[PDB]
């Protein structure tokens, strides 16, 4: 309580991902501890502060400029002549996401592709499409908030008893425009070939890389990137376009995260009361080539979202400080 | 412990200069107090930082 002597035991709703079992009484009403508390600290997420991305424009000072290459075929690094000098960059919406880019400027004219070293499979293959598609990860059922005062002015926003049937949050993708964008990409993916490719899923590792993690009103939505690799545009693209897939798929939710692998004073995402619906465009991708693949037979690509910086330089390849 | 209510007794090695026997009782009797705690607070010296000259 706000009083030092008075305490109170009160109940709320929590997730299984947010805690881990201890005191391994293998199964009799086992206790749990927060995953981040045992390793690091924790604080409130300041719910009045939002978490959505606004278009940010990075302006240069006097004595400097921003040279832009308006050529649509211009790749990441190289020479360019169609110059445009600017003082502030285009408004970039820093969508904090992994293995995917959302609400970004499209590489019109042709799907743009980049990579550090094409011979090295470990390097990230950046992609930037030329047509958007609506990806909707959604929690329809409402949330609840309860302000429990912990101290003299300190209060925690716990998740109260939810009203109605608590249906699981899930996610949706439209397969028609997605398969069209895949047709465009696999038309673009021919570096030296005409028809051979394989698409598999991630190899496993960190939870953020294993799925498509992003933000939705503070709630860290880890929506599953499993409906991506279920396609074979090997020989006939029309053969892969004929199976439409109105992909209804699972999407998990999390409250806490270590931003940029900062295992410190983490933040608990607060209640978001009302229906949650993250519908977003698609602008590009960050894939990776498998090491266990032949040289010329077939290159296996799979989503990779390790380096967050790759998600931000997708549109900065046009601009450069000069 | 890491949790609020959970506590535990653990042992270590310490010097005599760090503390002083609490003279409120008869003798020490395994009862000591930090010399600097009663005057002010105390925090660690960030052991990853050393104190060598440059």
């Amino acid at each position, epitope marked *: 309580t706000e009083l030092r002597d008075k305490n109170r035991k009160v109940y709320s709703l929590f997730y299984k991902l947010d805690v881990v079992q201890i005191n391994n009484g293998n199964n009799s009403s086992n206790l749990y501890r927060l995953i981040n508390c045992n390793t690091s600290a924790l604080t409130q997420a300041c719910p009045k502060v939002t978490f959505e991305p606004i278009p940010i424009r990075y302006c240069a000072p006097a004595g400097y400029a921003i040279l832009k290459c308006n050529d649509k075929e211009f790749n990441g690094t190289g020479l360019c002549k169609n110059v445009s000098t600017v003082q502030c960059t285009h408004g970039i919406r820093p969508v904090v996401s992994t293995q995917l880019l959302l609400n970004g400027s499209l590489a019109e004219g042709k799907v743009m592709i980049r990579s550090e070293n094409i011979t090295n499979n470990v390097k990230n293959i950046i992609v930037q499409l030329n047509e958007t598609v609506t990806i909707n990860c959604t929690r329809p059922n409402n949330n609840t908030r309860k302000s429990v005062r912990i101290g003299p002015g300190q209060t925690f926003y716990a998740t109260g008893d939810i009203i109605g049937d608590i249906r699981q949050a899930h996610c949706n993708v439209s397969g028609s425009q997605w398969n069209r964008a895949l047709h465009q990409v696999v038309g673009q993916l021919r570096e030296y070939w005409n028809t051979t490719i394989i698409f598999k899923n991630s190899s496993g590792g960190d939870l953020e890389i294993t799925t498509h993690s992003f933000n939705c009103g503070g709630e860290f939505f880890y929506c599953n990137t499993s409906g991506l690799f279920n396609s074979n545009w090997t020989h006939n693209d029309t053969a892969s376009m004929k199976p439409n897939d109105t992909i209804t798929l699972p999407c998990r939710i999390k409250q806490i995260i270590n931003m940029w692998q900062r295992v410190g004073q983490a933040i608990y995402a607060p209640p978001i009361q009302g229906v949650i619906r993250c519908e977003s465009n698609i602008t590009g991708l960050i894939l990776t080539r498998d090491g266990g693949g032949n040289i010329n037979e077939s290159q296996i690509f799979r989503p990779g979202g390790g380096d967050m910086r790759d998600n931000w330089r997708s549109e900065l390849y046009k601009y450069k400080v000069v | 412990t890491e949790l609020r209510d*959970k*506590n535990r007794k*653990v*042992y270590s090695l310490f010097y005599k200069l760090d503390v002083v026997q609490i003279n409120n009782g008869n003798n020490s009797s395994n009862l000591y107090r930090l010399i600097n705690c009663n005057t002010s607070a105390l925090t660690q010296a960030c052991p990853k930082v050393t104190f060598e000259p440059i």
Partner: antibody
Amino acid sequence: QEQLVESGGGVVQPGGSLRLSCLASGFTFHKYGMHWVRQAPGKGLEWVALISDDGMRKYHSDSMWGRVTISRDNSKNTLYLQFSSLKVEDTAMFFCAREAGGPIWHDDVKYYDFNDGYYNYHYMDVWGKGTTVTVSS
Amino acid sequence: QSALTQPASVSGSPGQTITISCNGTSSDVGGFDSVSWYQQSPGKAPKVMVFDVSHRPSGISNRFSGSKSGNTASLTISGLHIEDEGDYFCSSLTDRSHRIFGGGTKVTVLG
């Protein structure tokens, strides 16, 4: 749940020995100082032996002192009692009871031992199955 | 070595209050207040009914209470239930950290 099972007890004769093994499950037995108790025919409970969490010290009733030796095995999560110079008066069902939970409580605050040990010196909260021993000449 | 002495058996009506009282010594009862009371039903292992005499262990209702007077302990039970039947044994921790059990009292509901 936290379960204890005694075994090894059986019909024996005085002057020999016996090995009573008390297995445990459902908790971290590595620091639970157990209690060996006996109940004779037509008699009440009678404490036999007690061992600390680390096996450093141990306590035996002056009647049963010397005849029995208690030991622990944290790897097996087991307790053991080795008898010697058995007497006909030792006819009883032997039980293997736990100690007063893991920590010791005071003012709602719980204290564990050194290296986070599950120590106490209090009532026995949990009791085991129990095994019979019949010493007869 | 000498078990804590109490009557061999007592009985009481359904719902009638009663109070067992067992004797001891100052080395165990009067020297340290860690006096407990166990219960054993016919066909059941022992189970604790009192420890920390002015407080009770798990699975014990407010009907059961404990008190101590010098070298003696007492177990009061108001509102005798059907589960109260069985042999009660008071025990105390000695100054040598050893435990000692009581003689026993077979409580049974009248009827």
